[PDB]
Design a protein around this ligand. Structure first.
Ligand SMILES: N[C@@H](CCC(=O)N[C@@H](CSSC[C@H](NC(=O)CC[C@H](N)C(=O)O)C(=O)NCC(=O)O)C(=O)NCC(=O)O)C(=O)O
Ligand SMILES: N[C@@H](CCC(=O)N[C@@H](CSSC[C@H](NC(=O)CC[C@H](N)C(=O)O)C(=O)NCC(=O)O)C(=O)NCC(=O)O)C(=O)O
Ligand SMILES: O=[N+]([O-])c1cccc([N+](=O)[O-])c1
Ligand SMILES: O=[N+]([O-])c1cccc([N+](=O)[O-])c1
Lengths: 220, 220
């Protein structure tokens, strides 16, 4: 047929590529997904997914999931459906993306490593508890903010909010499920409100459905 | 006298605020440093340093060290001495900042936690080795790139390069010093070249000197 605009190098299990999948569906953009078995370093020297190739921009490549989000909205969100136009809003949107990238992803991922996805002999629930506690602390930070604002930035849905979704879903369903009586809605009602709003959006729900189906299809 | 432009909430031991200290000195900007004992959540809901108050911009506040770097150069680097002007360069500069924020800081910090700065009973050199190995992997990523480019972006010094300095110095002097025969110049000569270029810059050297002096003055 005709070449789609984007290649998203993604992974069925790993959360981070699905931030980008969510945004591409939200904006209605055309992309193929390549699930990478975890070249590729030719597209990202760090050797990690996601990476994005923009075939309609001379095969421009961007890696780091949150940098990909910014690229997409800076080039392909002219009506600012999921982004912002003023300088002040832009820098605060970037602030919250860096909090996601440095404060959620890595620490949620260490909980996942020691609880769930390391080789079984290397899993360690005692060490994992350090990062389960960090998950709850991050939830507490989000709670203190979202108790008094609808969205993170400019009172509108942006990629700042979207960037938190996939790891938050992983945390609630897996990483802190059953941890010391954790109850998402009771313990962090504002985060629950915000998260539930996000995952019930058609495009985001479609992304989560696609991820589940993709896991079901990957053998094993 | 007269109020300085910026307040940098910093810490003597913690690396991350010193990225911002480096940039402010490089640009010759006026700032006071407040060393926070580790309000403050009034300036950052995450409750972490650094945070920046811009008194000449109606006390605008930005937190997350790499978001602070972007704020400073986007508003106060009109000649692009440590930043870039084209879209393509801007997005790749942001890409490398997100790699620093998500791939260096957090994993280097976990090595520091389990090796060096956790309460002594909670330190664990076996667990630390997971993150010492991640330090070397990050060095290997930087090596593969810096063997064929002088600086990370646009063949010029930017905040992308500066953002890596403080954690790299901590890693070489502490976190992987003596780890399995680690020798910075022999094992990662390109990273060593780049890092040495950075720390010998007067403003960056001044920042590192100030940090050492600040540790020497903080009692204990
Ligand atoms: N900051 C990067 C992180 C990208 C990333 O982590 N990609 C994973 C797939 S998501 S899977 C989640 C991922 N876990 C892992 O990657 C587990 C393997 C790893 N080497 C380890 O030892 O921890 C993690 O914890 N991420 C922390 C974060 O989100 O910031 C990958 O490619 N792994 C290949 C490999 O490791 O060899 C981004 O957002 O793009
Ligand atoms: N991404 C943020 C990280 C900022 C940050 O980590 N600030 C530290 C001082 S630098 S000191 C380095 C810091 N270690 C710590 O903060 C140790 C305490 C922590 N609660 C823990 O249990 O790990 C770390 O590992 N950082 C990972 C990274 O750079 O991304 C802080 O305020 N700590 C107060 C507290 O923890 O209560 C940024 O760059 O601004
Ligand atoms: O990558 N992880 O660290 C991780 C951990 C726990 C769960 C899942 N998950 O459900 O896809 C992923
Ligand atoms: O904060 N840390 O994780 C850390 C670790 C190891 C060393 C230093 N240091 O030297 O300032 C800091």
């Amino acid at each position: 047929s005709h070449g789609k605009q984007f290649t998203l190098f993604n992974h069925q299990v790993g959360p981070n590529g699905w931030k980008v999948d969510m945004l591409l569906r939200e904006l209605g953009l055309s992309f193929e997904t390549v699930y990478v078995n975890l070249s590729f370093t030719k597209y990202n020297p760090n050797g990690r997914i996601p990476a994005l190739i923009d075939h309609y921009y001379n095969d421009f490549v961007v890696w780091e999931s949150d940098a990909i989000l910014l690229y997409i909205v800076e080039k392909y969100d002219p009506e600012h459906k999921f982004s912002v136009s003023t300088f002040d809003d832009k820098i605060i949107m970037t602030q919250w993306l860096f909090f996601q990238a440095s404060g959620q992803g890595p620490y949620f991922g260490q909980a996942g490593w020691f609880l769930a996805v390391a080789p079984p002999e290397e899993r360690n629930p005692t060490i994992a508890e350090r990062y389960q506690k960090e998950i709850l602390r991050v939830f507490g930070v989000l709670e203190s903010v979202l108790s008094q604002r609808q969205w993170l930035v400019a009172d509108k849905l942006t990629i700042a909010d979207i960037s938190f979704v996939i790891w938050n879903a992983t945390a609630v369903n897996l990483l802190v499920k059953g941890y010391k009586g954790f109850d998402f809605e009771k313990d962090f009602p504002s985060v629950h409100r915000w998260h539930t709003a996000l995952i019930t959006r058609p495009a985001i729900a479609e992304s989560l459905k696609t991820k589940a189906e993709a896991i079901a299809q990957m053998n094993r």
